[model samples]
Target: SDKKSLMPLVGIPGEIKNRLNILDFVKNDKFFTLYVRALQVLQARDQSDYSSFFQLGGIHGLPYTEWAKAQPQLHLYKANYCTHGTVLFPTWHRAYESTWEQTLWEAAGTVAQRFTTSDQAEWIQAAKDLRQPFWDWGYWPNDPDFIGLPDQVIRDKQVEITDYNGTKIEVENPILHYKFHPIEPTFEGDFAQWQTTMRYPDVQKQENIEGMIAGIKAAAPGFREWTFNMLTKNYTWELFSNHGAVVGAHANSLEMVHNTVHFLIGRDPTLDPLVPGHMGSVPHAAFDPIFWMHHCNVDRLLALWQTMNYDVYVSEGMNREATMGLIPGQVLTEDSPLEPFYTKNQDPWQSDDLEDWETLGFSYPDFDPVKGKSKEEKSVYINDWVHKHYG
Candidate 1:
């Protein structure tokens, strides 16, 4: 029933985390007054912050093969190669998590008609907790550790390219890499140069909510005294605890290296995808707008790992070409188009208007939804649960 009196984001609204800062709500008219005041505080909150899921993590939501085996050379772009054939980045990231959970289920189905079935089961547990937000953008723990110090070797920097009549070109990419230069200077492109120098300054200002809870209580005493001395030190107490010092200060930001370089070079990093207007033509999510608030905070950390694993749900890997391909020997059911571009709600859970893949639409979590013991026993139980939970 009302997803057991839901409670995840418990009536979300701390000014939607002070307008989730990506350059102060993308250089603002308070981004539609912070999305219409967080859709009028989730339509005048009720149904006790209904949840099915709402996790969204970046340095969180494990499972991208256990976040690429705890940072296996974490480079970006779906860590290269058409990432096991399209879901074109999970159907353009579940169409921004079903357009921000169908505008919070049509503003909580226009206020409380018995909280619209737990706000449509919190938009089907935020589309079954979407994920993939790994980031690194070449060494960013706010640099300056300069490892073994001394001239802190930066090796003759500076490079640029332009050519074919446009002129300016300077190159170097003969492989052997692992260079990450950021030495601070990144309020992540200072919110697009503070929207072109203070988006028409002359004293323009807005970020309020008592100046973001007084900058999160003056950055909670150097971030809660380095997250309570990493949960009372002893280092590797899982990298000095308290959610590992906020996952080691968001693995050093720069908006997680331009959304992991627009999920691996799409919003142009001097294009290449094996040459020619580059493979599968870019349009990297309409070339930025922090790619839908960095996949809506990676769909709120895959709805906080389906709320800290409710008995590891289920998907027994039917590998219908890893969930969707739609043609070559057909597959992707549940009305497919969760990729190969787009398509909106074609009967998945809306009472099976038949789009296959087991009556489409899903809500999951609360476990036990099995099935998939063939295709070599679901590829040796998904490669022995990815080498024992991500090698």
Candidate 2:
């Protein structure tokens, strides 16, 4: 008992952050099986049932839903104050994603244990190995495999799943599209259009692929320069935060990179559109299954940035007042609360708690900005690794 007490507390294994390409996590039998089942569970719940952990849309009546309504009246909640364009952007999303990851993990574990016989044991391990995987769209934007909407995510109808017992069963494809469980009656405007997930170019298109590639190539050098800047630059909350106005060396911000991918994949050809693009707009984006993968990659980048800039940012204990753009006179601090969510124990989280990914029970794969002879060399290394593992 003494020896056990001295040993580390047993818990779920910390998440291993791997590239989406390397794991092809979407296609992994265990992952896909559990994922489909979890979505089915979530889809079955009533929108009003907050007790259901699998509810898709929003938290309480505030934030997502409340903010969605406020958007028209006061333009108050354009993005549900998800901490976009603010110092809390990175930290807020970190908390948000971690919350989602934990929810899925719980669902996966519960479903896995339901299988009978030896399959149950294997499914449990699969559930344990399950962590949110990220799509590194920037790594190989030109590649066909990475360019288009993933095949698993775009199926219009039923898809086949091989169960833990090796029995192939047909289920309504959850990943193919997300149907909105409308939170309000007579949801109008963008909310109405978002009853189901939709994407532009109608389907994946060559032009869309080319556009994404061009955008990534153009932003690549900026990313390189920013990597260096983050390492050497002075520690300021603002420096690590906010999407800058344009694309340049100083403009090479994580928020910018995150926004670019959203626009590229969510682009609509219509010149003067009244409604927002599905994945492009925040209100509707999360409904799409691809949204999680995209955000997972964004979280991965944040982890890399933290690792690279640990000396300057973490060591120095950077702190500065952040102006809330939409809510004038409001300022954000490291202690500021990230709202509309809570931990597994029902405790609300603040920005300070989200600073350490390890504390959150996860760690990303090693990322060294200077691993190769040049920026291109480093890119090639990662690109080659992607193909070698999952191509």
Candidate 3:
């Protein structure tokens, strides 16, 4: 007879991916050292490299979305590849997020090999533990509070990391802003002179880094309200996932909540619209490394929603082909391919294939408590988390 176990679990070889809060993720000395170095090395690579920071961020917007092996149809070549504001939004992002995780993991493994130590095996395991670190923007009562943007995201100019001999060295904080080797040529007009990513830049082009942080914190409580509503409200897959009103159904969707954070983070002035930060605009958002952290939170919220409504996925929707990778006035269903994320036979990953958190090879920290619990138990446990923190 199979004995059912209720004990706390331990790590299995490769099944569960633990995407951590940015705060806790940085606390690990061994892993953080490798993680930071991995980002540095990845960011430092030639922009032409497939997984380099430049090219990967480019996949979201700007320049144009390019795939590694497969080519899209000629008409789709210039499409942005990010399906923002459509029902396909989260599923498309889920594919991008997985690619983001896989790319960073490769960098971590490569960096881990550089450290020559007697404890080398431990470094390898640390590299294996690396997944895309997420910022739980809705997480409140943080040890030192800045619910919208963590201090680690904005405050640090450079961070201390260990090197080959295990000696400490301070390097530029890749998280602070992705220093675009050369700001993309596509970023013309106002942002042309900008060589690095910024937040709340003034008309004079000085970064109002602290001002944006203040504005976001002032606006952060609103984020909690919408997030809590989106997580708990049992709207159908179409109404629950995107920003489109889609006629009679009017409700807050995960995509709508995400947009508010973007505008707040990059808060543009009424008189001078040109001064908003990289986060505010689609073309440059991913270039700002903070974009990844924010999107990870979006992905986490979608994942939490899935835990409650496991079988409810993409449904029929009347939609404009909002951003890239879709025809104008396209009739969208679960089968629409999320472009640029190639899978078997050079085909793109579709919405139907990306339904579970485990399917994407990752899980959030909050998910750990709900393991082996019933759907009813999961709702109660999840509700407590939503009410206590995000509320």
Candidate 4:
């Protein structure tokens, strides 16, 4: 059992964090090679298989149409398996990302040995250091250079990868898009539209990109402040787990901020008349590669929130029935099983189990909490503090 245990850190190490950018992490020689290889392995697996790529996207259950046709007895068990629109949103994804990180880390180990570097030790160390990077969309939205989708995600052509034999070859970039492979012959609801990757409000034009930037600029501060306010103000779990009534002006919870980015980036024009957006829709969001990076930052923010309010939030206030999106009598506690994800030993991981990320072997590069302030206000404060102190 000990041999099956893994503790991969999700954040980049301090030495590398200063030098790395989202583009750099995605394009790093080792990271890119192993990311493609791991994705290929996941893609090759059968969808019905638990560890397969599609299953990890949190959308493998019977389609809504099919579920509707099923008997009443089966309805509760069969319908909408993933834990979105609920308290389990953050913890469910923590386990999901960890599983994928483990898969990638193992793949990196195998690939590391084949690398033709003269310094075998350094090469192996670099491989060991490979961890999933978070796209801090909150921070990037304000920057001029990152106003559009990162070039790595939107690139139309193939890129080079290093072979096991140490030879370089070009292949389609795995991070740009994800192709869905359904286990069933026919799936419910617009299955054909999702066969390939899609993003609405196409990032190609400056005007289209500006629209996203505008949304981010308005929403990021509210997101950054929401969690801190929850902890500081001693908000109930019911309020903290659900979306706030207001959108950009005052997001009172993490989910509110989380929902804004999904809607802004995943807008689909064709489906806009009927639906808000595709990525904005839970069923199809994970099919896009951006979802993982986006959620990674969400997890990162959770880590920061936990650190800032450890005594109040983690020690005394973590275990409670999440008050959002449950049936009238159903309750969600900290011990609630994060559905559809398993540990190396095949045991279901719960919310309480993932609260302390260090036990799981990873931590964010930094945590600086500025209480009762907007993200912009906090950003200016942090920048000034760092300049005065570090310099």
Off by over 4 Å in 4: 1-21, 59-76, 116-123, 140-142, 165-167, 182-186, 201-238, 244-250, 268-278, 314-328, 342-347, 367-391
Ranking by TM-score: 3, 2, 4, 1
Task: Pick the TM-score winner.
Answer: 3
Clashes of each: 13, 0, 0, 1
Residues 1-391, model 3: lDDT tens digits: 2222111111123767688888887777777787788888779988877668888888888877554533234555465778866778788888787877777777888888888878788888888887777877665564334554556677888888877787888888888888877777768766688888878778787788767767667666666676788887755887777777543243578887787778766655543556777788887788888788888888888888877676788887655655556777777788886766655444556787778657656788897988888977886787787778777
Better of 1 and 3 by lDDT: 3
lDDT tens digits, residue span 296-321, model 1: 44433232232332222222112223
Q: For residue 325, give model 1's deviation from the true position in Å.
A: 13
Candidate lDDT (C-alpha), each: 0.26, 0.55, 0.74, 0.54
79-183, model 4: which lDDT tens digit per residue? 454555455666766776676665566666766786665656655776667777777655423333444245565554576777766678888777766666642
> Model 4 — which ten-residue stretch has the worst lDDT?
64-73
Give all candidate RMSDs, comma-separated: 23.2, 8.5, 6.9, 7.7
lDDT of the structure predicted as candidate 3: 0.74
Distance (Å) between predicted and true CA of 201, model 3? 1.1
For each candidate in turn, the TM-score is 0.23, 0.71, 0.89, 0.70
Flag clash pairs in model 3.
none
Model 2: per-residue Cα lDDT over 1-391, one tens digit each: 1111111111235554333442476678877788788777766667655423323344311224431111233443423436666667777777767666666666778788777656677787887777776766545333333433455665437867766566889888886666766634534554454456655433322124344445545555444454444433424556665663232333556676677677755764443542334566665566566677777777776765554445323111222322222244466566666654444444446766667666666655544433324545544554444344323
